[PDB]
Symmetry: C5
Subunit: 376 residues, 5 copies
């Protein structure tokens, strides 16, 4: 993930222009190879036309180049690229929204599951570990970085996501499908056992724990669905064919003919087709947005940092359910204990952001005495 | 479903270009028949014009070709295709999102319904089987593959989805409507009976079971609605006529006229209209995206694997509620039992994915000592 | 509703082309009258230009046609039509999604409201009848077909939706507004009475019943809102003016001028303006899609079958709460009672749809032994 | 709100054309002033060229007219108008969806809060009045019509929305912000007092009341947010400048020059620029859609009827919680008491709408006897 | 945030035109710097071309200008800008929808947590302060204005958001991640302690408190996600390059050449390019919409007022849970105590907004006596 939120906080002078000096997760990094191949092909065709072809062959090539210009339309390529990239970006954000975070669940497990003894600690840690294990199982199923980190369930055991007993149970339960759903059934059964054992005081609390767990299950299922149900290959092939056909036509149609024969639009002979290269940049970059975002769990620069999320979730969830259980700061009266209207101070840097309240769009309407009188 | 998520994990050199060498669920497989018909017609009209028309007839045909070529831009094919295909793809993903998964319900039935005896096993299996029966009834109503697998309720009985008693009860209840809603009423009544019999310990647990079941009912109803309420036929007819009229005009307008007559743009006879064929691939493939996705429960390569989903749901749900009920792995301290900050290891392959935490876009803002002083 | 889901299950050879031979809910049925008027006007103008106008008047008419030709640009009409039709189609599907189905509520009333005696039957039937009465009240408010079926509350009484006592109570409560909200208050009061009378065993069950009823109330309110708050008339007038101005300009601008004068673009005098008629088909059909979908509760072929929904809901809901209450099929061990991995059979027709499970996109990543050891 | 749903129920002959004969909430009413100003400016420019300008001045004006007409196309009025109006219409419907309706809350207050004595009546009326008071406070904050009806809190007291005691309490609580949130805290505290006093029998019922009230609070907060967070002024200024620049250029570029000079496009003199006026109608009406819909709580014809909603909500809510509490119609066996398959009658007008049930898209699939055998 | 809702309440004569005389959050303020740089470059190129350039160099420059002006339209600028700005605006409103408001939570804490003594006051204030502390932690993580106000946790302690005990506890719990999640775990533990201590009377009330808090946690997580996961840098770079390439081409292609040469399109020389400047305003303003809205938590004029929200939330939440707990206005019969149909009065200014109720689109449908008869 390339984060530039801080750089674009304000709409300053050339805010977006300063982002063109970035290499990591940039357009240049994405399309330099394709641009070099296109450049080599274009200049090979140019040299063949200018040196190898005879006069009659040169005239035939010039007619072919003039005929190619009529089939280069930007409206269809722009429309198909716009729709396809919009779908890819929508799916990309939906995929991010389905990354499971244990924060709601870990707050409920910290609160509800009682006991500061070893058994209560073990129960809370086991429940939150089941949540983390389900998340890491689906992530190593869908993310290449996580898979490279945990290429086998034995790696999960060595890393401490799974105990050897849990590994044995998963091997025993093995079916010919992905087994990422198992820790959620384990969580439900352990929560029920905790409630029957008196560690969860009320069934309303048990229902709340299960609702959080089921929300995480739904998120994991969505991740699996996005990994499995790709954007239809016909749509991807259509957009690829559109872009590549456009630039294969541009290889011949955008060749600078002899300025001696003053063909319309060929009176000036540049050596570098600036507009063709700009169009290459725009359209191939638009396609590379989709290329990078179509699977956001790969190892691209702008792909999700799944390994960081896995580590953070484990650390934070274990701290929440183990050391922060019934460990609250001393409850004392605050700064505004007898202040009816608290007014926190502003720093010198932030004094200009002190604003009067917005009281509604109708606040400043002025009416006469006659206009405000109720009628019978 | 053709899955190519693994192939497009990273935006490598020509990432989308390598997908053009795929046959299953590809553009070529979708439109090779239409392309062969178009090619045959194009070369029939070419041979009629060149070998079976007189001079005056040839001149008339050349005028008709110039008129077709000059006015083919009047067909708004890209606009109608874009807006239609976007709607089709939206409905396709919505249809997938309404495929019922019993995973939340199966976890709740595994937890809540108590009893390791025969009566408990039968009760849990019966509830999860009612969920699976409802799902398979709606799927065989809307999916051609599932219908071919279960062309009658007796096939459901032979396949073990439906008990002979359940078949008799469905025949007894028969109304002049689709009976996919019956297993949900059966589930509600059996859950109430289980709660009254003490197998479900608290009514809060019964409410949770029914809320999950009702979610599945809503998903099944959405599937039925999508099957019934098609995309309006007028919209489909409009888009079809746009594409077919474009490529029927192309039959005449894209003919290579006699180079002797020296018509503007017809000086070169290439025999093969390469750009017309590229346009055919692009526009007919764009239509074939909608053609394949308009009913995602058919037998296309990119259609949903409904039979696999049916089999997996049955296997997983029965395992979850029968063998995994109160069958938990041994609960022992994990490897980070007294580690305040766990740090799972990284492999050699994944060492480069270890990242520092994102602490917010404001983390690196630098302020002077005077700028950070509170003002009165 | 014209349903063609079965016809478009697979992307076969000319799948969408076979739908062009449909008359009911087709484009031809929608625009034949407008097409005939446009054709009659076009050919009257053509005959006036060819016969009535003198030489100087013919030259003026030809200048007018050339001047009109520059202003028949399709880029604006496609933009307004696409955005407007997208809004109409979105509202159309949202309107369908707000059709109330009592299936969740009917399952909860069948389960929760106890009693196989006359009083329990009467209570369950009365609750589900209140739900159906609310639905039919809003539908006859918004749907012309339902109104024609029930043009008065006495028709609802004769049809058995409403008892004479309920009719008297509605007359007694009458306010100067639509009274579709009344049965929901009746349902809440009757549910509370049932819970106080011991027919509903727990307040958790009562809360579940009320949540389902309130969901149906929200759906009915959305239906009322869509019926009341039309798409702004200015937007509809704008899109209508765009299309009609385009095809009124086409009456003069798309006249075939005398080919003798060799005007640019008028060299060939086809009698029938094939491209103008295709443009008419596309743009007026796109507008007719909106015209038919703008109120989906009328009597168009593609409008919703509200009367069928009313009848089905009543039949199903009454059967669910009356005959199917505590009427469960015999609960016996299933076909896979001691089968750890059930495998339902495939028919000969469906054997090709058996697939191996998708195990995740990272399953087939290969790593070396050196890549797979954890680093400290 | 202009409702034309009844007029557009069916796709009749020129359904949308008959809406061009509407004045209230029409395009004509919205842009007649701007059209008159544009007409006055255009003909005044024409007169100055035809009468005040000398020969060399006329030639300079003709060059300017040829120049402006060529680059009027450079303004992409259609794309920016389409996107901006789509955003405005989206926000308009979202704003409507956040108009609070107390129907779910009023059903729960009617059911749950017990007591047919004076204290129960007073408690129910007070709770529903707090809901209505919150709604009217936010509406008079955001709606000009409601503000004109209630220009002060004393007007709310005179109109009976607020008791003098409630007014005194609001004055006592006054903070430098909008106080629309106060009645929700009052509702929560009064509900808690009712539950502690035995008027609400169970805390599950109290939770249901508070969930409904909080939904209304969220809707009111969304209304406040839409009133406060306008569409960014830069976007509105961009679209305004695009449209106005287009039609200021058209003042000069669409002038009918001297026919004698025969400049291409100006060789024929028509005093009325029909196509420029049609373009004015289209583009300025497209902008006027956004102009009217940008604040849907003003006093436009197509703006929301907030005063009607306020009156209806108060009447209906008070009737539901006061007169309709435990006042149910006599519960008697219905018309279909012993009818297994009820079939409500159809009128003569509605007999054609009787349809057979849709049984699924797979219903009519035909298979051979061999195709329906299960294989081992 | 610039609010102009009051200015655009009605679609008056040139309502959007009057907004062009705004400076704060305007197009002028956003792009005056870029416009001055573009002006300086354009007039430097003009002076280089007209003077200090030889005849042959002038001819070369004229050929370059004709080439650039002819091929400038090849840049796709409308399509990419439309799609990108739509994505930015969608994300901007989603970011606003995730700003946490404690109004639901504050009502529940005011109602449920009992006790008018010091301990109850302290418990309520502490819970609502935990909610506010979580909100301000995430906001200072994502908002530059809030960070400038609270550049350290010690500033939060001095401002009264955090007690020194809470600061010590946060320092003790420190992990290498953002610690905005801590107050939610504190809230859950303190709520559980309150329920065990009898301050919360029922576990259903505790579940309602935790559901509200978890909703606020989800909103904070969404804010963090939007701050972290920027719009892909490749997409931003593509759009920036499109706009800047367009106007760098316009620097040369939109030069007014020597009128002596009488180029087709340069016959009129105006020193100021009005159309190029209009295009600059339109396209660069469209980009500045995205530039300002890409991070809505900066210090732009149209950015969110996060400091105001922080102050208001603290003032309102503390007042709601401390001074307004069980402090209700006197419950007395209202103005309509025995009025079956209340009718609040209208003022003279608002008398025209009194409307009859909309009774449904089918209300005015007329039928014959024969059409209304039920058929057998
Ligand atoms: N004939 C041409 C060849 C190339 C270019 C260009 O894109 O720069 C323009 C015209
Ligand atoms: N001058 C013309 C008139 C009509 C048509 C057409 O639409 O076919 C084409 C050219
Ligand atoms: N040749 C031209 C130079 C500049 C302009 C313009 O004002 O945009 C138009 C034409
Ligand atoms: Ca990727
Ligand atoms: Ca299909
Ligand atoms: Ca209709
Ligand atoms: Ca308005
Ligand atoms: Ca900003
Ligand atoms: Cl070709
Ligand atoms: Cl005109």
């Amino acid at each position: 993930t390339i984060t530039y939120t801080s750089q674009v906080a304000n709409a300053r002078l050339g805010s977006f222009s300063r982002l063109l000096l970035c290499w990591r997760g940039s357009i240049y990094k994405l399309l330099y190879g394709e641009f070099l191949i296109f450049l080599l092909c274009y200049y090979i065709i140019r040299f063949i036309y200018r040196l190898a072809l005879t006069e009659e062959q040169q005239l035939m090539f010039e007619k072919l180049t003039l005929y190619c210009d009529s089939y280069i339309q930007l409206i269809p390529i722009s429309f198909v690229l716009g729709f396809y990239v919009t779908l890819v970006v929508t799916r990309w954000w939906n995929q991010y929204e389905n990354l499971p975070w244990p924060d709601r669940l870990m707050s409920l497990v910290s609160g509800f599951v009682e006991g500061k003894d070893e058994q209560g600690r073990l129960l809370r840690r086991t429940l939150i570990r089941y949540a983390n294990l389900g998340n890491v199982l689906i992530l190593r199923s869908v993310s290449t970085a996580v898979y490279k980190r945990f290429p086998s369930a034995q790696h999960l055991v060595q890393a401490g996501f799974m105990t050897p007993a849990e590994h044995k149970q998963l091997e025993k339960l093995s079916l010919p499908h992905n087994m990422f759903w198992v820790p959620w059934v384990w969580f439900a059964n352990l929560s029920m056992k905790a409630w029957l054992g008196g560690r969860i005081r009320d069934p309303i609390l048990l229902q709340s724990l299960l609702n959080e767990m089921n929300t995480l299950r739904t998120q994991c299922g969505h991740l699996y669905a996005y990994d499995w149900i790709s954007i239809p290959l016909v749509y991807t092939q259509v957009v690829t064919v559109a872009v590549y056909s456009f630039f294969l036509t541009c290889l011949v149609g955008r060749q600078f003919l002899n300025p001696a024969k003053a063909y319309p639009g060929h009176e000036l002979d540049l050596v570098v087709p600036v507009f063709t290269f700009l169009q290459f940049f725009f359209y191939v970059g638009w396609l590379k947005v989709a290329e990078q975002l179509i699977n956001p769990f790969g190892e691209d620069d702008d792909d999700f940092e799944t390994n960081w999320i896995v580590d953070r979730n484990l650390q934070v969830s274990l701290l929440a359910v183990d050391e922060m259980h019934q460990d609250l700061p001393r409850m004392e009266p605050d700064m505004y204990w007898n202040k009816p209207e608290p007014q926190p101070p502003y720093t010198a840097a932030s004094a200009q952001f002190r604003r009067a309240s917005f009281m509604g769009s109708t606040f400043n309407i002025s009416l006469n005495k006659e206009e405000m009188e109720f009628q019978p």
